[PDB]
Write a protein that binds this DNA or RNA. Structure first.
Lengths: 50, 77
RNA sequence: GCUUGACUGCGAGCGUGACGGCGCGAGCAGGUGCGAAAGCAGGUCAUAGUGAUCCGGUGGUUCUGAAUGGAAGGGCCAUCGCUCAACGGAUAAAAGGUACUCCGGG
RNA sequence: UGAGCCUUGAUGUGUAGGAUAGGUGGGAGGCUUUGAAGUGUGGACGCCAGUCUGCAUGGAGCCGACCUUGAAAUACCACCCUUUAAUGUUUGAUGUUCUAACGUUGACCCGUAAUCCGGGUUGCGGACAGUGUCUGGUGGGUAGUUUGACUGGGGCGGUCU
RNA sequence: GUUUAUUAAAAACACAGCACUGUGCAAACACGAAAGUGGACGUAUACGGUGUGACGCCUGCCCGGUGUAAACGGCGGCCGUAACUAUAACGGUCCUAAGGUAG
RNA sequence: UUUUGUAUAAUGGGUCAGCGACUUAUAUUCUGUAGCAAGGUUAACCGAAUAGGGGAGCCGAAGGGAAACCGAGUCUUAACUGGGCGUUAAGUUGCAGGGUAUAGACCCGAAACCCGGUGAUCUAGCCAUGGGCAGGUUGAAGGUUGGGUAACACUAACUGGAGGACCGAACCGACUAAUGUUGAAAAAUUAGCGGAUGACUUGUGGCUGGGGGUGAAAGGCCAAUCAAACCGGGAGAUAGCU
RNA sequence: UAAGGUGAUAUGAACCGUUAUAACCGGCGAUUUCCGAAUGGGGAAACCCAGUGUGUUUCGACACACUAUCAUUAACUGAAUCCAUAGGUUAAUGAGGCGAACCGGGGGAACUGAAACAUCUAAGUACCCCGAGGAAAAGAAAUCAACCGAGAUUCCCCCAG
């Protein structure tokens, strides 16, 4: 789902992209381990600003 | 207890209806699972008995605003 | 030999049964058939040939239509599916064998 | 590896034929010596008529109604149908790798002069195991189905309208 | 030895022995909506379930349906064979897997 | 009292005194009485509180048809000579009484079902800690010597003291006979009987709780009870029975 | 307020007071043993067994204020593990228990009727559990109605069996 990456993880990321990934990746790689942010429809526009 | 700590879901009593409509009491058990979380703020592995629907809610919101209302209603972790 | 009166809407009044039922039924109106005509025909010489209620199938009736016009559903008419044979037909729902038998009594 | 798909390009004989031209639509100027029609096969399709393209005979025409075809443009521009090819997207099967999910009734350390519990580190399995929702089948091990009425001391056996 | 204390003490129940089935440990199985516990601080010479009932002669044949029958089970015909009958350890058949051994 | 039939030997009452059974609440129907009369009546409420106000609402004077609809006519049918149902004939509000239905509904009296608690001081089993078993008799393994063998095997004394061994006291149990059967005792006594060094028995404390527990298994026991304990409640369950 | 009184079975004894300190009746304050939420540890209820600061012209043993549990906050300390949590102690606040009915919520049967019986029914009733108060709950429409309109919630009588 709509999580945006931050790191040099393998080829679905380019230092930040909106993707449609499976649930394990989001929760058990990206929720609480780091490298991402949840899509609260505010954080995505905030990091679009950043 | 089998209580979803995030959404508040708990088992309720239902009935397994037959073809002859014989009533038998049964409780619907929510898909509850224990999963460990790693908070960068407090430097600790916290585990929570949540549902998969609670997992989807905490994927939508985030761990911090969920803990902000877990500290509210007397929950322990 | 000719024909559909084995037609619809009826029908006073009656017998017989606790009732439903069954049976005859003069005669009205329309439309028919036979006969030259008078007249007769609303099934089978009569007494048995039967399955009611519920559900479902088919068509119609513009009868109703949870805001309006529809529509759905319901109601009315005609009809069909049951050895419901235990047949005036108890519930959606049991049949059996003990020769695998046992107890009590005469 | 099987199925769909995004982009790139070919793909279609009533029959003769510069050429196996699909359908409805615009259209009278475009290219080649930054090397062209017209002829040939290999893998390839086949009604062996030939075409596609790698290669190649060749070195100056193709073209627009064209002098041919029942239906005219491989002069150009568009959404497309069938066939078929390429990597890749998407979804399944097979087996392998992981270490993060998860389990650990393996060992160690701390809270802790604690066989509870919690945390860390390490190892072992491992997307199984186990669990929630729905559902197919199995299951007289259990239950509800209640399993009808008339019969003279009597052994047979029937009857119901 | 034990049992129906208060109408039945035994031919009933149990019994070591013998045998079968299942269980590889976080065991089978059981009490538990779960935690946990028993099994067991035991490890296939151990444990659970079942059948028989000391001991001797002994347990013969069959795995087709659910190689293994001391499981759920079966052990029927035709002729041949132990001095004048019958029975047939044994050896063929009917392809149904095969037919009562000893006593 | 029940019966076709009771003095019947079919059921009940020893006697007396006291208590004790067709009611209450709500709808509906009928009769009598009472006001008003094509009208009758108020519910909640206000209230100087059984007064008065308050007519929201109910019944009836119009019915037919399933209904739209039509209307003193309506339904049926194309329409009836027609047929069914009605029409100009008074109801309503009170009170009392006789019924109906709902509730325990004239009164007393089941095997059963479920819920919440209490019991392992009795008994069944287990765990932890202690105690008891008079006396006599028989004599296993092992140790030594002798006979026998190349040496064991086998044999004869002595030592040794093992037995789910024997006889038999306390103790445990009740197989026979007798008494007791309004008992001495809601299971005992008297005389015989079996075990009595074990699978023995006992004291104390704990554990196992009812659709369960326990059970060397009788469907035995769980407080003199058990083919599902007691206490309280649903419950005044239900009865076509007496 | 007072000439009577010291409650009753219950006399008797010993007394007090009579014109203002007898008794009677009321408000306030204190004492308020022990068990019992029971609260220092235990506990077979009215019992047993301890520690810290304060006091002994008799400084032995003891009395006084304390020392139970949970939730939150603050402070001080404080692990693997740097940072920081968890953990420990103290201070303050609140609660623990009882109580006839009423309220909200979570579980929640069968007897009986249906003349059998399983749908239904009894019934969200009996019973259990948690919490709160003098009331609780609910309460200002994503409510009705039908083209007119009503205008939070609550209770009663009709509509309406």
């Amino acid at each position: 789902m709509q999580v945006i990456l931050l790191d040099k993880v393998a080829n679905l990321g380019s230092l930040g992209d909106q993707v449609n990934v499976k649930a394990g990746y989001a929760r058990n790689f990206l929720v609480p381990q780091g490298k991402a942010v949840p899509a609260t429809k505010k954080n995505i526009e905030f990091f679009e600003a950043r | 207890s089998r209580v979803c700590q995030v959404t508040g879901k708990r088992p309720v009593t239902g009935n397994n209806r037959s073809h002859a409509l014989n009533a038998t009491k049964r409780r619907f058990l929510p898909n509850l699972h224990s999963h460990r979380f790693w908070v960068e703020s407090e430097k600790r592995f916290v585990t929570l008995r949540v549902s998969a629907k609670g997992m989807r809610v905490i994927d939508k919101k985030g761990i911090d605003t969920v803990l902000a209302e877990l500290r509210a209603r007397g929950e322990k972790y």
